[PDB]
Amino acid sequence: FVEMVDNLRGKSGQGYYVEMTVGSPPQTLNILVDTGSSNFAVGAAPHPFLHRYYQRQLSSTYRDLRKGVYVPYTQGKWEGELGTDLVSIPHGPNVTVRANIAAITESDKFFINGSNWEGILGLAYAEIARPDDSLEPFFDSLVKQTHVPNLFSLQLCGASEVLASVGGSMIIGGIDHSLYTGSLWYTPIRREWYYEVIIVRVEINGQDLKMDCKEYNYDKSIVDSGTTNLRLPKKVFEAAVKSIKAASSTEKFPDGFWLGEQLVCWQAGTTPWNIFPVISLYLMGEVTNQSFRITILPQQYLRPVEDVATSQDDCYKFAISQSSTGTVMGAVIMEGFYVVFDRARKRIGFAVSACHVHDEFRTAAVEGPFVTLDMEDCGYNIPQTDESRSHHHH
Ligand SMILES: N#CC1(OC(=O)[C@H]2C[C@]3(CN2)C(=O)Nc2ccccc23)CCCCC1
Numbered sequence: 001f002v003e004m005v006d007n008l009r010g011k012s013g014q015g016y017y018v019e020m021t022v023g024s025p026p027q028t029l030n031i032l033v034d035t036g037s038s039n040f041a042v043g044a045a046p047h048p049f050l051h052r053y054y055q056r057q058l059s060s061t062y063r064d065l066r067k068g069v070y071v072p073y074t075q076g077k078w079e080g081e082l083g084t085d086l087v088s089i090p091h092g093p094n095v096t097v098r099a100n101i102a103a104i105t106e107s108d109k110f111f112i113n114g115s116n117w118e119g120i121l122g123l124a125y126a127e128i129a130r131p132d133d134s135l136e137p138f139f140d141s142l143v144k145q146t147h148v149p150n151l152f153s154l155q156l157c158g159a160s161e162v163l164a165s166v167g168g169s170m171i172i173g174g175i176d177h178s179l180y181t182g183s184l185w186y187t188p189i190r191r192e193w194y195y196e197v198i199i200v201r202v203e204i205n206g207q208d209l210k211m212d213c214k215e216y217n218y219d220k221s222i223v224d225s226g227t228t229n230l231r232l233p234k235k236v237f238e239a240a241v242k243s244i245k246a247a248s249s250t251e252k253f254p255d256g257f258w259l260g261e262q263l264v265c266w267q268a269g270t271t272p273w274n275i276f277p278v279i280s281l282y283l284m285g286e287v288t289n290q291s292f293r294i295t296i297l298p299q300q301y302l303r304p305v306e307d308v309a310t311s312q313d314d315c316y317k318f319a320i321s322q323s324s325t326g327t328v329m330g331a332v333i334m335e336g337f338y339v340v341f342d343r344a345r346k347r348i349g350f351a352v353s354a355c356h357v358h359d360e361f362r363t364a365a366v367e368g369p370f371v372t373l374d375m376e377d378c379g380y381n382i383p384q385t386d387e388s389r390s391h392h393h394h
């Protein structure tokens with residue numbers, strides 16, 4: 001898997017992407033790696049934020065499926081035309097697949113200026129593909145058409161006129177032992193739609209937030225590489241920010257800082273990391289009544305941004321924010337860890353990443369087991385709409 005190491009790039013806060021080729025002859029494009037969605041979709045018409053885009057008509061192996069697709073996210077949306085073509089990952093497995101591709105013809109608040117990606121690779125399950133679960137996701141096609149094992153793993157590595165470059169690895173088809181240290185701990189995938197997990201306890205510097213554990217998973221908790229922040233349900237966000245504010249209270253920051261909308265700075269090299277607390281999320285274990293914890297540092301949840309004006313200073317953005325759509329374990333969380341998406345065994349593994357940023361006193365940690373007795377159920381059941389109910393599934 002050495003040829004897949006360091007195959008991801010991007011700008012801090014703007015997504016990690018992998019190079020792919022679509023079509024014959026191959027058109028090269030940079031594709032956002034997104035475990036929070038299930039479509040393969042590529043810019044296919046001019047846009048102010050795209051250098052280049054997919055030209056269906058220049059590919060001898062394109063086949064039009066004569067069907068449109070509309071995809072709205074909580075933030076951002078796009079539409080396009082469905083088809084299939086030949087697809088490869090140059091710094092990936094040595095194979096070519098015929099996959100579904102959505103050629104994006106219109107978009108809004110989707111493409112990111114300066115990000116250097118032109119599409120998205122949705123690595124989650126068919127159940128949330130658009131327009132429905134009969135549009136086979138890319139990874140499913142890869143596994144079906146080739147020998148590739150039904151697993152992939154992600155190592156996202158954290159960081160004056162441009163945002164910092166970042167690197168990572170997407171290991172397709174297995175696990176590379178150079179990318180982590182210590183033990184790999186797995187949490188069950190609750191349901192194969194998103195990569196949904198269950199958080200059973202949250203601590204901030206060793207202190208339990210003491211919420212009903214359903215609040216942590218209201219309305220779901222998911223691992224999404226394409227979400228940049230750690231995003232927490234309103235109630236949890238507010239408890240968490242109250243505790244982090246308390247720990248850091250020698251420093252009085254503006255409200256904008258805690259809303260993720262304003263940088264705070266210190267003289268080069270003098271950041272008082274030790275006044276910010278560690279956050280531990282306890283995830284359900286493979287064994288009943290077991291859990292293990294993943295522990296992240298302020299070096300993960302404070303994102304570095306070099307200020308054009310005060311470039312003499314180390315400045316940071318707060319990269320935890322409020323959610324109304326569940327807990328999202330985004331790139332902030334993932335930057336601590338080597339994360340194994342073990343679709344074959346319906347589980348997600350975490351180990352301490354060999355590239356996580358830390359300091360001389362504290363480290364991002366993956367530890368267990370921890371045991372409850374009569375561990376209550378922490379999962380939420382989403383209200384079922386008539387629209388959703390009426391769908392058939394043949
Ligand atoms: N909506 C949603 C969620 O994420 C997604 O659907 C994908 C697409 C994403 C980031 N991950 C998004 O949302 N906007 C956006 C914009 C550009 C690139 C990637 C994305 C996040 C909330 C919980 C459900 C899943």
Ligand SMILES: [Zn+2]
Pocket residue numbers: 392393394
């Ligand atoms: Zn029917």
